[PDB]
Amino acid sequence: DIELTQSPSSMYASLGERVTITCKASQDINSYLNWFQQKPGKSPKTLIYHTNRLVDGVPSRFSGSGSGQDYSLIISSLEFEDMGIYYCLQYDEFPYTFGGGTKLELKRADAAPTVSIFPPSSEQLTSGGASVVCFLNNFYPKDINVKWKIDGSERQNGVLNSWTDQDSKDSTYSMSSTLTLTKDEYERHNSYTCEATHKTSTSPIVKSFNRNEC
């Protein structure tokens, strides 16, 4: 198989900057190189075939270049809708092969998360479970730490986290953290806290409730 190595494997750039990503083949592929764009949870889309030909409707800011083993895809002025993962593909020899992809993420202003905590619903307690939910929404950059505290003491098992990919509207990230206990455990303590620590502050944002109210 022909091996394709893409570089860099991820990138950050601002609106209006030039961007260049490269695809290196393990042997000469005689210009038979396509580029695809894939957005989060969507299908891939064909941008460029045969090194440098634009598929119809692909915006003019895209171009491609290269020969032999060394190919590039260039965006002349970055737009918000260009976020996603970029894949090269060679079709010089079977089996056709893709690079590992280059993730392109858009820069924007720093933003603290909006943090909300929710006690377990009374519905869930009737089944004997108790999940406490913490939403950390619309923050930038993506790196974040969430810590759960039961009566002032850190808790780590029963915690499940899920991150969104980069928002197509405001370029922020969001996260959901669920602490699942038994009802029995839940009823024995009073104070439940999620603490988010983000680049924007050295103080964590602290949100909590006391089981003793509704």
């Binding site: 299908s43 909300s116 969104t164 669920t178």
Partner: protein, 216 residues
């Protein structure tokens, strides 16, 4: 967006087989190669093979020679890929695409597992009585304990789409848990009601949950 139409999500036991369709409408089905691609989460894309409908011509990636079988039916403009003796390395999204321009299917998710189909429990997330009166309020739905993927979550049957984050499911043991949040103006809730709708086609289940402020 997407120009070809694929068959829906599939849950299939280890050792068994599935057949995914790819429908390609237009008068020239026999003029275009159809490519088949595999994507496992975290991994990238991977080429399976292609077929040229109506020609007797097919090229397989060596790696999938005994795993994929391609056919096409020209009268219905439909290409098929059967996947056989499935294992969990076969759990992935599969795409079909024309070898020309930008013509890709929406994809078909395949889950290889003998775990039991399980409907979700749908729980409201309403603000605690430690009630913070900024000018926006966030609400949520927890969708817990279901299998397989997917569920689709909406708010007020689709009418509320601004302010929504639906988070990817997480798989713990053999069950998924997912949450969705929605942020709306404070003045408008609870007077203008907010309902989460969850559909789990695999269990033929649909649940609607009004998010109600907490009582005492």
């Amino acid at each position: 967006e997407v120009k070809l139409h694929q068959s829906g999500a599939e849950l299939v036991n280890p050792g068994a087989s599935v057949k995914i369709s790819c429908k390609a409408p237009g008068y020239t089905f026999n003029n275009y190669w159809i490519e088949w691609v595999k994507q496992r989460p975290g991994h990238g894309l991977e080429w399976i093979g292609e077929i040229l409908p109506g020609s007797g011509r097919i090229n397989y990636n060596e790696k999938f020679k005994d795993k994929a079988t391609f056919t096409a039916d020209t009268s219905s403009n439909t290409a098929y890929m059967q996947l056989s003796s499935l294992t969990s390395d076969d759990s992935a999204v599969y795409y079909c695409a024309k070898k020309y321009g930008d013509y890709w299917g929406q994809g078909t998710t395949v889950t290889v597992s003998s775990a039991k189909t399980t409907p979700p429990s749908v729980y409201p997330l309403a603000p605690g009585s430690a009630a913070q009166t900024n000018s926006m309020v966030t609400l949520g739905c927890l969708v817990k304990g279901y299998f397989p993927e997917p569920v689709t979550v909406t708010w007020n049957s689709g009418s509320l789409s601004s302010g929504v984050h639906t988070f990817p499911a997480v798989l713990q043991s053999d069950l998924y848990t997912l949450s969705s949040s929605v942020t709306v103006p404070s003045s408008t809730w609870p007077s203008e009601t907010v309902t989460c709708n969850v559909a789990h086609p695999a269990s033929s289940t649909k649940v609607d949950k009004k998010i109600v402020p907490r009582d005492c």
